[PDB]
Amino acid sequence: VARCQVPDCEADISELKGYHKRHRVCLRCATASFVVLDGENKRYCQQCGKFHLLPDFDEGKRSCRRKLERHNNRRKRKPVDKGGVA
Ligand SMILES: [Zn+2]
Ligand SMILES: [Zn+2]
C-alpha cells in the first residue's frame, strides 16, 4: 500500500517512483534519514528497506547489526583425523 504509515508522518504516497513507495514510506522520510516514530526514532535501513531502530546501529554502514556476517570463517579443519584406538 503506497502510503507512508509513519505515526509522526501520515503521508499518502499514492503516486511515487522510488525505493520509498515499496516500503510504505514517503521521499521526505527516505531523505530525512530518521523519523519521530511511535516514541522512537527509526532509521530507513537500505539493507532491508523496512524501518529499524536508531539505537540499534553501529559505525559499520547505516544498517542493522544482525546477520551482517556469516560466510567468512567457514572452514573444516581436522587436527586429529584418525580418532582414538586404545
Ligand atoms: Zn513520511
Ligand atoms: Zn536491516
| Owning domain of residue 53 | 1-65
Distance in Å, CA 69 to ligand 1 centroid: 31
Question: Which helix H or strand E contains 28, and what residues bound it?
Answer: helix 27-32
Q: Select from 67, 77, 42, 69 the least CA-distant residue to 56.
A: 42
Of the listed ligands, the closest to the CA of 23 is 1
Q: Domain for residue 74, yes or no?
A: no
Contact 41, 34 (CB under 8 A): yes
Domain count of the chain? 1
Cα 24 from chain centre: 15
Whether 20 is covered by a domain: the verdict is: yes
Closest CA to 14 of 6, 24, 49: 24
Ligand nearest to the CA of 9: 1
Extended beta strands in 1-86, E state: 5-6, 9-10, 34-37, 40-44, 51-53
Q: Is residue 72 part of a domain?
A: no
Q: Is 45 annotated as a binding residue?
A: yes
E strand residue ranges, 38-85: 40-44, 51-53
Strand partners of residue 44 = 51
Resolved by: NMR
Residue 52: inside a domain: yes
In a domain, 39, yes or no: yes
> Which CATH number does the domain housing residue 35 bear?
4.10.1100.10
